[PDB]
């Protein structure tokens, strides 16, 4: 190929049978996938370079864990999640990413566990028409993560998020969503939760606050990096 | 009035401030409201008879608790939940009701805790248009309920439900909903969860299975009554 | 059961074959069902106590008439109307209820006969998708009611209503509906008219004004009660 | 102009103030407008030739009546009805046209009076969004027409119709519409009823059967023409 | 018939096979169809008088060309285009009409070639539901028209238009459409392009400016008539 | 930062304003952006490494050109296009990518120029509601591309495409879209064309066939690489 190609079984992932673990962390940024795998895992290998969307496999306290970049937005993560599920038999899928907080009571240091997500994606209206489908986290994964946070005293907030198609949106309804108690905005959760459930696999999204969208309250690198480490510790402890 | 009238502040509830507790159990059937209050609570008073939609307040373990029938469907529960929240300052709202199970893996003895609900009600499209709003349980209540169930060894399943407008529906999508992991069908949760969140109150729906919609298999009175009691016990332990 | 159970053939109505008349009046309030049956009919029997949603049968000038509370909202009346039609072979279904007036020209003393109803329920979009279905009264019933009113001099207005899902609605379009000539808001007619037509039965909604929703002009008990009497007289004279 | 031009106040009608009566019959075919005016009215003048969409004014038993072709479809009739209402102060608008019957029980000789109409036009969703708006005939006009038919012994049916955007429609739902009681299909009524009501004017559609859509039962010229004459006689008598 | 009838094969066109050319110009105004045929073509015959929607066939530099009025709006043109395509085997369909300009940069003398059209017609949502279908001109016709205009120095602008259902529309989104680059508003192109494409025929809409919608800046007869002649010259040269 | 960060002015592009050209080629795959820049351009520098979404700038025959990976799907390309337009004042935006052909008449060697795109993205319904917005290519770029292809003898097809949200879609309407003349499926064009038009910039999507969706017929490496090189050659000649 002119550039790396996927496998016949997975057009966007150039891996073979067995190279991807049953449990996969899913950051949006493939360079964060790299950073996570190299910083937290042992015996790391890169199994995918197709489209520069790096995927890695290594071990955490003897258990195989993969870390796969998803890109941004429902259509991008849907491609990777479908291929992970259908071609690599992945069982547990945990997004680890950022969100923009939309309520003042959402604190910079809180690790957010998404129970569900609202969206302006049409993906579920395409499937259900007049039905509003509410995606749902796997409770076992969510509870294990909450327990991992609580056991250490890591601040954790459990609620809902909004999965946006338009990062830049002149027609945003973030103010109203915040009034209805939605915690923050990201670009992946609705797809991860819907596709995992449709195929009987377990999904969870863990998120940290990268900014406060409505107040412009600033975040610092120290705050963001500490909370990021807590997020990855929670994700890994919860599956251990 | 020709029949009992609501109060000026609450057109559908004939009570006065203080007569309803800050925690209210919400069965759909006002005769189950009566049964619950008289069976489980002490020193019970009926504070509402408007439209025969009985509401009661009594004592459980040193606190006042109320039990208010809601009727069936999003529009009916919305009227009672709005009035309880806005006129009686209710803080914790816990639906206790039945659902039709739509998956083989949902057992007759399972107490269901709804994380979220899908719907064919237009109530959220009316507010949000192109946005699919995903209603969300209060996790504090949900986790307390889960912990109460686990403490006794009551079987508990945590996931999503479908809030139907049409109990009889030629255009039902319950097969597809079940494929997407939805546990069962009921007629209230979307409204309870959306309105509680909009007003910063805490809600949870606890459900027991009254029938298996897709396999057709019937429940026994012994199965239903056992699980009903388990649901009420769990409910009475959902608020810290 | 712990509380009254429906019959096998009608989950929400605990009656047997023959106990319900072929002509049924449908107030929303089951206590008004009781008031109507006991005040206007002879030899009254209560055939349903399931969910406290009382239904009665008696005679009016030798004709059997039933009066069945429906509860509030499209989902609730849909349950009762489906069971009445499919399980008890009911032929004539006449709602007798209240509405909030939305036009200054609608007088508190006018009995309203609904030709059709607009709605924000999704029930018909669930069935028809891109089609806007316009529910339609049975003209024979409507004509007979109009003639009954005119023969005595009872004030009568014929036009359309709006069937709301949300009695409390921050996103109401009642101002625009009034500009388009809609008379008032209630919570049942769309379902009654659509379901009766689907099954080839005759329906009509007769309504009286409980409130002036936009002008804030209040109604008195004397006005409401006289007009209620006129409504029931029109319903019964019209079927005689 | 290269061809006849509308007036400054009415882009599609080349008339002056006063040339159009306050009561206007609205056939879809401008040649039927000519036929009706010439055959039924005295001292006929043609007030419009713009776009060949003929409009005429004459007298029937001394009352001024106009007959204006509308063309086919919601957008075409909307142009004429808006201009008639807004620029010529028209008060009573009565469509006289054809429909395709969609029920076996609709008889070829029955004159149809439309109480309301369903549609697949987006015109009302454009205005109301999540609301299904149900257009409504003026009851005074409808009742006058019904009484004129009964007085003259003309067979008459009253019910609802469907206003189609697509005369040829691979995605038609007319079989389902017929099951819900809809009598026939035409292409104008939703716009006439909605726009007349929006401006506080009176409208009615009277229709005769030109075709049996679902059965291909045949109609004859003699049947069609006799019933057409009945329709026009009903329209004119109802207005005098 | 009381007035002219269509043929059995084409309900709205009273012609026989062979009488209509494989290339048809489609003005909305049948009097403009007449003007075009009589002014530009030789040996003209009128093949249709049904509903006064005149169609003509003649020759231009020896080539058979038909000119068929369409009426206004998606439903009217859809009737004529369906019949032309399905009953008369028409291959090339070129609308020649007017539009209201919605941008300052669209000049009164510019001949507009529409690449595509937006709409508020539901015709494509009826077919595709959640999909936004974008109708597309045949590029060969478009390029031939472009080349014909350039050859003479006739000013030409290529871009998109908006096909409106409501010429008079209180809920218009013209301002937003102009911001997204849409050139003008007309009432036919979406239907023409969609139906031509569905049947593998070639379509193009050529348009001239009759009005500036947002500024009320005036056009004169001399401007409109000169540009009209340019439009017909481009259409005919382009098929020569 | 833990990984590369965007500029304050462009959250997802870590470049200084002067590092990006006024003309940007937009492949979905950032490794194809690398290949394009290294293969075709002189004096190449990489200006972005944020999220591994590489962007490069060099010269082609003396003209400054950038090549920026967009990722897959409307939300991803919308981020990059908004930042290019708003923060780097990019004027010409040309997607160079793959599509799945959906018609037998689309040949493997055909370079496709998209005039417009349909979609199942909700992005335009979010903005326009009841309006179907049809995105439009810049005709100047399209015509230059067409002219360049013809000059070289590269087979070119001009028509419409479908912008999918779901690469894997159980509810796909590909068969119907092909019937309506749509050429192929990709995941970016609607966003590119909509956002460029909204901001008065010029856009075009050029596409090559990666496979035949509906016949399973595969392409070969030699076919794909030949046509890729044709596409880039054409693109490098689309700006006037």
Author numbering:
A (entry chain D), B (entry chain F), C (entry chain E), D (entry chain C), E (entry chain B), F (entry chain A): -7 to 232
Task: Please share text taken word for word from the publication where this structure appeared.
Purine nucleoside phosphorylases (PNPs; EC 2.4.2.1) are versatile enzymes that catalyze the reversible phosphorolysis of purine (2′deoxy)ribonucleosides producing bases and (2′deoxy)ribose 1-phosphate. For this purpose, we choose the hexameric PNP (BsPNP233) from the model specie Bacillus subtilis, which displays great biotechnological potential to produce NAs, including the antiviral drug ribavirin. The crystal structure of BsPNP233 confirmed that it is a homohexamer with D3 symmetry as observed for other hexameric PNPs. Analogously to other hexameric PNPs, BsPNP233 is a trimer of dimers where each subunit interacts with the adjacent subunits forming two interfaces: the catalytic, which contains the active site, and the inter-dimeric, involved in hexamer stabilization.
The crystal contacts are similar in the crystal structures solved in P321, P212121 and P6322 but differ in the H32 space group. In the ligand-free crystal structure (form II), the inter-dimeric and the catalytic interface areas are 1711 and 1554 Å2, respectively. Analysis of the B-factor distribution in the apo BsPNP233 crystal structure shows that the loop connecting β9 and α7 as well as the N-terminal portion of α7 present the highest B-factor values, highlighting its intrinsic flexibility. As this region surround the active site, its flexibility may be important for catalysis.
